Scaffold this active site. Sequence first.
Site, PDB file in Angstrom:
ATOM      1  N   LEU D  37       2.306  -2.604   6.001  1.00 59.01           N
ATOM      2  CA  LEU D  37       3.438  -2.300   5.136  1.00 59.01           C
ATOM      3  C   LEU D  37       4.200  -3.577   4.816  1.00 59.01           C
ATOM      4  O   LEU D  37       4.505  -4.365   5.716  1.00 59.01           O
ATOM      5  CB  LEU D  37       4.368  -1.281   5.797  1.00 59.01           C
ATOM      6  CG  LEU D  37       3.695  -0.104   6.503  1.00 59.01           C
ATOM      7  CD1 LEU D  37       4.713   0.689   7.296  1.00 59.01           C
ATOM      8  CD2 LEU D  37       2.983   0.786   5.497  1.00 59.01           C
ATOM      9  N   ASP D  38       4.510  -3.774   3.535  1.00 57.24           N
ATOM     10  CA  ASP D  38       5.298  -4.916   3.099  1.00 57.24           C
ATOM     11  C   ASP D  38       6.785  -4.557   3.135  1.00 57.24           C
ATOM     12  O   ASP D  38       7.190  -3.552   3.724  1.00 57.24           O
ATOM     13  CB  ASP D  38       4.830  -5.396   1.722  1.00 57.24           C
ATOM     14  CG  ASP D  38       4.603  -4.261   0.735  1.00 57.24           C
ATOM     15  OD1 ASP D  38       5.545  -3.492   0.451  1.00 57.24           O
ATOM     16  OD2 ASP D  38       3.464  -4.136   0.239  1.00 57.24           O
ATOM     17  N   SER D  39       7.618  -5.381   2.500  1.00 60.57           N
ATOM     18  CA  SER D  39       9.062  -5.236   2.622  1.00 60.57           C
ATOM     19  C   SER D  39       9.650  -4.131   1.749  1.00 60.57           C
ATOM     20  O   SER D  39      10.843  -3.843   1.884  1.00 60.57           O
ATOM     21  CB  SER D  39       9.754  -6.562   2.299  1.00 60.57           C
ATOM     22  OG  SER D  39       9.616  -6.884   0.930  1.00 60.57           O
ATOM     23  N   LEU D  40       8.869  -3.509   0.860  1.00 55.76           N
ATOM     24  CA  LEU D  40       9.358  -2.326   0.161  1.00 55.76           C
ATOM     25  C   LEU D  40       8.771  -1.025   0.694  1.00 55.76           C
ATOM     26  O   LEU D  40       9.314   0.043   0.393  1.00 55.76           O
ATOM     27  CB  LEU D  40       9.107  -2.421  -1.356  1.00 55.76           C
ATOM     28  CG  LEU D  40       7.793  -2.761  -2.074  1.00 55.76           C
ATOM     29  CD1 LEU D  40       6.850  -1.575  -2.242  1.00 55.76           C
ATOM     30  CD2 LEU D  40       8.136  -3.310  -3.447  1.00 55.76           C
ATOM     31  N   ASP D  41       7.692  -1.082   1.479  1.00 61.58           N
ATOM     32  CA  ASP D  41       7.134   0.146   2.038  1.00 61.58           C
ATOM     33  C   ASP D  41       7.986   0.689   3.177  1.00 61.58           C
ATOM     34  O   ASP D  41       7.972   1.899   3.432  1.00 61.58           O
ATOM     35  CB  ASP D  41       5.702  -0.085   2.512  1.00 61.58           C
ATOM     36  CG  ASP D  41       4.786  -0.545   1.400  1.00 61.58           C
ATOM     37  OD1 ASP D  41       4.999  -0.126   0.242  1.00 61.58           O
ATOM     38  OD2 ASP D  41       3.844  -1.313   1.685  1.00 61.58           O
TER      39      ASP D  41
END
Lengths: 316, 77, 111, 78, 113, 70, 155, 111, 205, 164
Positions: D37-41
């Site tokens: 997961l990245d910083s918007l997920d």
Amino acid sequence: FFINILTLLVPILIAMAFLTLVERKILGYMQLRKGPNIVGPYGILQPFADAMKLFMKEPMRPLTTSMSLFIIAPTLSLTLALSLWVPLPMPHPLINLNLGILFILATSSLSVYSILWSGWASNSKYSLFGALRAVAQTISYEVTMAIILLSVLLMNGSYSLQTLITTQEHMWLLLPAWPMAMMWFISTLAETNRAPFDLTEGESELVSGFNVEYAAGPFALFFMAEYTNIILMNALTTIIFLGPLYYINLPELYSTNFMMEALLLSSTFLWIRASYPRFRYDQLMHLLWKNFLPLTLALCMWHISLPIFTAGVPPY
Amino acid sequence: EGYQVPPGATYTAIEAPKGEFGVYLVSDGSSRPYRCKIKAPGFAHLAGLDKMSKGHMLADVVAIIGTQDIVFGEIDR
Amino acid sequence: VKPIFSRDLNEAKRRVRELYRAWYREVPNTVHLMQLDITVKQGRDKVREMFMKNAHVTDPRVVDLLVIKGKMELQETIKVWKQRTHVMRFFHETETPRPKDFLSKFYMGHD
Amino acid sequence: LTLDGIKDRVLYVLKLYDKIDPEKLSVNSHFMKDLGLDSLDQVEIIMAMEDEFGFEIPDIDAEKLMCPQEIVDYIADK
Amino acid sequence: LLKKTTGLVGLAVCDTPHERLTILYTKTLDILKHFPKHAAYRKYTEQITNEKLDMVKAEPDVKKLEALLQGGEVEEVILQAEKELSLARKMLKWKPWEPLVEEPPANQWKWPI
Amino acid sequence: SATRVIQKLRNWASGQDLQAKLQLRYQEIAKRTQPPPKLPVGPSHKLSNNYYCTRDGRREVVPPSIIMSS
Amino acid sequence: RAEYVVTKLDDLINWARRSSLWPMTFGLACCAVEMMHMAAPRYDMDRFGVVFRASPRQADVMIVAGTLTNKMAPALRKVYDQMPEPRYVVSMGSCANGGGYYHYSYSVVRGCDRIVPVDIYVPGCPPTAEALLYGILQLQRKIKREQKLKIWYRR
Amino acid sequence: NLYTVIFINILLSLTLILVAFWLPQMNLYSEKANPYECGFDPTSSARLPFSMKFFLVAITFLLFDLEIALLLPLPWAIQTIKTSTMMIMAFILVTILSLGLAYEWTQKGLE
Amino acid sequence: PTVRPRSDVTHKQLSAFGEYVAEILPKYVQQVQVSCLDELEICIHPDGVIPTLTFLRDHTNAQFKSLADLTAVDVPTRQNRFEIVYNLLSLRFNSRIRVKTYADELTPIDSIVSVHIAANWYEREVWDMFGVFFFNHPDLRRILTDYGFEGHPFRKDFPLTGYVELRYDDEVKRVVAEPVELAQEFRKFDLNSPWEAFPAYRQPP
Amino acid sequence: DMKSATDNAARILMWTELIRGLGMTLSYLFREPATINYPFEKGPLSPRFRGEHALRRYPSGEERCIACKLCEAICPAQAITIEAEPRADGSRRTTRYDIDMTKCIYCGFCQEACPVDAIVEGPNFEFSTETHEELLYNKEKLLNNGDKWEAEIAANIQADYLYR
Ligand code: SF4
Ligand code: SF4
Ligand code: SF4
């Protein structure tokens, strides 16, 4: 009876389409154009071609509508306007109704209902503005319509429409009631919805008002009921406020006097349509309710006053 | 080619009967204009229509666009 | 250089997260209300891949101008100034994608 | 109320989420480290938590939020 | 007599134009006392308001005040002088009398380029 | 080209002389088959003193003067 | 032999559509003042029986005047689809023909033939009101000479 | 007679509706039967609460409608023995009908 | 009769007014140019554009109440490529003034809504056509471009013909967008004559 | 006074200014209408009427278009592609002419640019077509257009060339 209702109803539809023809012709003569003279012998074929062409124009069943009320509105409007014509007195009425002017007033109050049914069931915001201004035109016209149809008919003293024919044989009725005739004229412009007081089918206000979603034959039925209401309340103003000559042995002289007086009154109806700028419903409610409602109530007071001022009361 | 036009900027506001009309020509020294803004008269009028149409209704706002006389080719450019 | 809103990158990244939160909040209203011919899941994946399209920039003024351009797209999406035609030209339902390998780009044109 | 039922509901919302594998799901699993997961997920999964529950979570709280035990202990005391 | 129509719309007429003009000219003189003497907006604004206030105390007629103010009408110069008062307070807030904050690049104001 | 009774009818409706000044052009149009008009030359179609450097309006402009700063 | 009856009923059913054609009160143009010049009493609409009805449901034919831009294109086509199925398109103007001016501009649709089926093309940035009276007459004879009941009969 | 003219009028209007429907061709689609707001996707539903401002004038129409309904038996009421009684009391009734509008015009009810 | 006659009294009195404004605003005014066409071109600094236009509107001796025009001219040679103009016009003094500031496409200009509500639409038009942020605008909503038009079009790096081009389809029944390939290429003409045109406007090497 | 009170109280409550406006509208329905039956009666034009573009000719054969490539440098539509070759005669004509009638602003620039007056803008308006291909006039359509209207153009040019 069936031959009589055919020769009453089919020539009034042909004369209504020919009224649309001479409406466009004398309207274009007011606007310095010759009018639709190409497609007929001096243009006697164009709204017959409109009523033909709108049959095989495609009708509309939208997603957002209710189709039963959407299709039951213009058929009730055509039945409304063509069955408002039957208690008209003429020489002798087809329906000899004992209190038929209240049926005229009731079905013209029904005439400002199918437009609201159409403007709701079209399911557009534009048609909803046209429906709300049809409600505003009801709020404007209806009480002054009833008071002018009450107070000058108190001088006749009966709601039988046949008894007005014998009242005005030697003199007209606009000579005892001249403000009542012009106030009847400007209220029947509101009931008829013509261009001084048209505020619910206007191309400059909305996209033609309440006929937003109506194509083809239902739009032809609404236009049919519209121009049937035009010639209908031209005949109402003709049969109340002006008195033609009655000979009991010759009703045809009375009928051609009705013809010349109704042609000049329909000419001044489409002349008053094509002349004036078109209203806004704020000052429509303002001039009717503030100005012309207590003038109708005060000339209603003077028509209370007249049969005890002189001559007794009118016959039954 | 056309006119070789000397460089610099001018803007000549004249009386259009809608109002102010003037074009802000800049010239590179070639025969092409570099840019111009064409001053629409009704651009600021229809910007300011939000002020004058408050407290009124729809027939008043079609009366005020008919009064203010907005045609849109000079405005949308 | 003069800033716009952000004196660093992570505060503008927080603004990007706020705009992504508001776009994810807005998009089922503009699926249901728009009478649109899609679901909500590939529309949200279209919003996510449009965020990942400009993912390579680490410049704070460029991503602040991306924040105001996403705010104008949000302002034209919360209100319905955009329609069902303007709102989903992003999906490219009609335009075929340009191929990325050498052989199909050799066969297609001089590029 | 339902202090284990809120853990059942957070397992329900990360079970209904698609990018996170349920065999890799844990109560102490890191979002940006071992779940892909990245910083918007993280904003996506706590915003799905936000529309699942109803109470508002700000984006200032989102960057300090790492693992949801402290936010369910914050919301479980009424 | 005072004018019923002001020659405009929205800008309403006032009953005491000499009193409002003397009072607001002394107010916009009093605002520039906190301006520095190094600021030359203080000297030129004090010059134009002192000369115009000298015209106001010279003439008692309202149309002669319009003719020697030369600003059209008396309500228009009341409105514009109250905008000048707000400008003097706002430029006290901004302090523009100090020198130039940044030189441009040398190719910025060259035409053609 | 109207008759006198309808002409006096619209003069009663107006008060103006529409018969004298109609809005439709009857015979006030000039004849469209015309003599060919010799257009005049301008002020500088002279063979003597035809020097462009005296009348040169496109070279008399100057680049704009920076008066005070920088 | 009912083919003569079919073609005479087809000419009678196209006579009403060629005579009482009702267009749309359109805009969008420099060219759209010439729709008002056909409305004007020199080269008249209503003499041929042409009435500017604002609604598409009342309209029978769209006279696209002129400039067709990219913001106006779904507003054009959502109006044109909701016009009911007797529908023709006159394209007044070279911007409605081919993108006459503004062809290589960024936000002008390059003719109205890109979007709607256009039955007749009127050239002109002034198309003269004589020229769109010719366009109304030639669209009129085009939908006269189309044969719907004849192609229904040989089907 | 009134029943058979209403019956044959609604039957001729019903066959006008049927010859409107079944005489042309039948082909519809969703972009054709989409509703009309000068050709746009729905910004809101039309069936929504309209806060119109002629509401007190509308209820004054309903009360004035009721007032003209009690005014309506007057051509039979003028044929009575108690002419001065109906005269004075009907004067009082239409006087207070005018006075209600006078109070509404004073207290700005018709705006 | 060919050359326009020159009235130099307006040139010297507006040059005295330009020296006046250049002295009274030394922080913001970078230069004042006076052309040969009796108008002034006050070139200023973009961090303080609102003291300049509030001084030009509210002062009794400038009195430029009515804003008229507001765009950029995009010259890509400069480091700050946009050259934002404010053409203003006094009703009472019958005079004109031009205020020119610069802009990069990353450095914003603080908006002039609080001094003129004429620029409620002009700055939105500038945000479409060139693409500068305007600080504390009420709404800087896009106006002239398409709803969803990526790209400010009036810059020199945007092409003439655009990038998208609309087209109706019957696959989806929408007015869809395609990348534009032309029916006919716009023929670029070399209208610059290769000889020297004006010796007064000569670029030094 | 009281007479102005009667004048205003007769303007209102009779609406006699609206009767005045009714009579002012009534005066124009007894006037002659200004229409024309268009396929039988046609309206006023001028010899300077720039209409359909047309290629003229010299009075003894010989196509006048001498391939200058200047009438697309003046054309603001960018409508004209006039890619030429020598005629293998020693003369100088065009092998490729294209105006575009769908572009074609009808502006009169090419009829004033032309140094021999080969392209002119002949006074036509009856060229509204049904398909887009018939307003894409290449060279032979333009040449027989000018051959069709050469007797109509040349008298207007003979009555108009003193002005230009
Ligand atoms: S063809 Fe010419 S006048 Fe006509 S719409 Fe286009 S630009 Fe306007
Ligand atoms: S049309 Fe005229 S200007 Fe154009 S190439 Fe031919 S001769 Fe030359
Ligand atoms: S008339 Fe004008 S637009 Fe048409 S081909 Fe000639 S120069 Fe080009």
